[PDB]
Write a protein that binds this ligand. Structure first.
Ligand SMILES: [Zn+2]
Ligand SMILES: [Zn+2]
Length: 64
């Protein structure tokens, strides 16, 4: 990773690698990692357009 500006996972902000398992959001449709979004690479199969933790948080009882 030498490129300055580039995609970064909101959870941690790793480099755009075509290896790890990324998740797909519907609200913001951002880029995240299964494990980062509290999701397994195997379960994703049964998951379709999961609500990333970045959005789900919005309008929360602990934090609005
Ligand atoms: Zn991450
Ligand atoms: Zn989202």
């Amino acid at each position: 990773g030498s490129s300055g500006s580039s995609g970064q996972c909101g959870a941690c902000g790793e480099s755009y690698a075509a290896d790890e398992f990324w998740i797909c959001c519907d609200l913001c449709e951002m880029w995240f990692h299964g494990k980062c979004v509290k999701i397994t690479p195997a379960r994703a199969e049964h998951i379709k357009q999961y609500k990333c933790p970045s959005c789900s948080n919005k309008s929360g009882p602990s934090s609005g």
